[PDB]
Design a protein around this nucleic acid. Structure first.
Ligand SMILES: [K+]
Ligand SMILES: [Mg+2]
Ligand SMILES: [Mg+2]
Ligand SMILES: [Mg+2]
Ligand SMILES: [Mg+2]
Ligand SMILES: [Mg+2]
Ligand SMILES: [Mg+2]
Ligand SMILES: [Mg+2]
Ligand SMILES: [Mg+2]
Ligand SMILES: [Mg+2]
Ligand SMILES: [Zn+2]
Lengths: 46, 154, 50, 110
RNA sequence: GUUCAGCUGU
RNA sequence: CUCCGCAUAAGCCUGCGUCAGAUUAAAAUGAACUGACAAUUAACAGCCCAAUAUCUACAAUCAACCAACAAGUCAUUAUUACCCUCACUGUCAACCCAACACAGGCAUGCUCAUAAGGAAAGGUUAAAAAAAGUAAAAGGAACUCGGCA
RNA sequence: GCUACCUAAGAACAGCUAAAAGAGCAAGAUUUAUAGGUAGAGGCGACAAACCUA
């Protein structure tokens, strides 16, 4: 019956899923950081 | 259609209506002069008059005490009713309260009234006063009245 | 020859006021005086965790 | 139902400026004899009423001090006495409220 | 399971 | 009126404390907006542990009796090594995910009807239509795709 | 971080017949918090061809 409440915030999940260490863990994630660095993102990751 | 419907619909329903009037009546007895929306003061005025009549029955009267107990939420007022208000009006047969419209209140522009128990200590309200007898129109009518006396005497 | 029976001059038990709350505090304290055993007394005095 | 067409300003002025929409001039306004301020004939003067309420509030504050608590309504009549006044024989055996002020001219001792 | 009996401003 | 409430966890991150304001809510006191100032103090909680070998058949259920089956959260010793002390961090709020008429969602402990927490009515009038509720003569599913038990 | 299934280690469940325990009225093929796993030529599915943050 609830709508639009997909987000159930969890800091452990947020860091583990999208964190800095997670991004560096694989080459694709490292390229994610590189793209954001190129674009000049203020936040490269969570 | 509301032909012959003497009572107003107020608050959240019948029971809420009585409680709203009871709270206004309780405030009037304690303070002897309150100001509230005109329609609510007008609706409560009848109960204010009748409450004095029950007070005249006396505290010994069981039915009167039951009425005062229900209508007066603050119990210290019950002695005031029987021992102060009722004796004050012992001579009068009615007209215990006076109700006057006051300016609309600022917030919601509601029509407002002031109601008091006649004979309270508080400073007198600026009652409306009829024109002086000494005015030009009243003097012409005073002369006419005097002549009708002479004609009636003859 | 009856006398005048007035209602006691106490605060309302259900009103939203300071005196009404003090009368409701006297109401639960009256159940501790009415409690027979000591267990019942201790239960009432310590069941509200704040 | 959605509007079929935009209403023109010409049509809207006729609606908005119709006499039925205009504020009516009031003819019951008058001048209060006591204070000289404006009032309506059937309504108490706002200036005079506020004057009574101001004094009434001070008296009620004095009544509160004497009672000194709730549910202490007295069982006798009350009389207000201003500075320089003494209890009358009629005003004897009554709760006395003392106001640190001269009796207002409009407020007449009875 | 119906019919029936019973109740309801349907 | 109570539909809750208080606390913890999770989330959130200063988000109704003081002062001031020309800002703001329907509201020129309030203020959750703006400026300045202040604040949550560890005992609760988080943050733990020397090595090598070795040990660990007997559920829980008031565990006793009578029983089982889906067969179960709870344990060491030996020798070596080791003299030192109370750091660091969380601690505020009217709070979160949502929806934008609470539409709704939300773990645990305690209270089991409150000692805690709250206000359905801006004022009036009392037309229709509409929504909900209550009462209803006689009849009691008749007239209706199809009532209820 | 929705949802489906699964893994780890947790938690919850008044009374009433109550032998039998069972969605009987009102303890289970139950519900539920936390972390993790399975990814689009795919995953997952007591299979709606559904669901996998519209
Ligand atoms: K916050
Ligand atoms: Mg039938
Ligand atoms: Mg400790
Ligand atoms: Mg705290
Ligand atoms: Mg309270
Ligand atoms: Mg309201
Ligand atoms: Mg109304
Ligand atoms: Mg309204
Ligand atoms: Mg009928
Ligand atoms: Mg038929
Ligand atoms: Zn005047």
């Amino acid at each position: 019956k609830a709508r639009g409440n997909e987000y159930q915030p969890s800091n452990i999940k947020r860091k583990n899923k999208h964190g800095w260490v997670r991004r560096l863990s694989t080459p694709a994630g490292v390229q994610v950081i590189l793209r954001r660095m190129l674009k000049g993102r203020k936040s490269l990751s969570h | 259609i509301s032909h012959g419907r003497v009572f107003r619909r107020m608050g959240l329903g019948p029971e809420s209506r009585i409680h709203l009037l009871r709270n206004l009546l309780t405030g009037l007895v304690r303070h002897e002069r309150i100001e509230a929306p005109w329609a609510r003061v007008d609706e409560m005025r009848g109960y204010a008059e009748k409450l004095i009549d029950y007070g005249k029955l006396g505290d010994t009267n069981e039915r009167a005490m039951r009425m005062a107990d229900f209508w007066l939420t603050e119990k210290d007022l019950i002695p005031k009713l029987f021992q102060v208000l009722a004796p004050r009006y012992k001579d009068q047969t009615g007209g215990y309260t006076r109700m006057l419209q006051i300016p609309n209140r600022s917030l919601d522009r509601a029509k407002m009234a002031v109601i008091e128990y006649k004979g309270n200590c508080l400073p007198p309200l600026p009652l409306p006063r009829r024109d002086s007898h000494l005015t030009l129109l009243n003097q012409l009518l005073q002369g006419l009245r005097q002549d009708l006396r002479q004609s009636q005497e003859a | 020859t009856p006398v005048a029976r007035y209602p006691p001059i106490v605060a309302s038990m259900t009103a939203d006021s300071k005196a009404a709350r003090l009368r409701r505090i006297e109401r639960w304290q009256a159940t501790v005086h009415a409690a027979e055993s000591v267990d019942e007394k201790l239960r009432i005095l310590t069941k509200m965790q704040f | 139902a959605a509007p079929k067409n935009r209403r023109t300003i010409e049509v809207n002025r006729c609606r908005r400026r119709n006499p039925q929409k205009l504020i009516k001039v009031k003819n019951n306004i008058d001048v209060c004899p006591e204070c000289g301020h404006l009032k309506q004939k059937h309504v108490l003067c706002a200036y005079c009423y506020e004057k009574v309420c101001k004094e009434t509030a001070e008296i009620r504050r004095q009544i509160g001090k004497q009672e000194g608590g709730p549910f202490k309504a007295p069982t006798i009549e009350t009389v207000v006495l201003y500075t320089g006044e003494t209890p009358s024989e009629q005003d004897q055996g009554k709760r006395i409220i003392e106001r640190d002020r001269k009796r207002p001219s409009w407020f007449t001792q009875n």
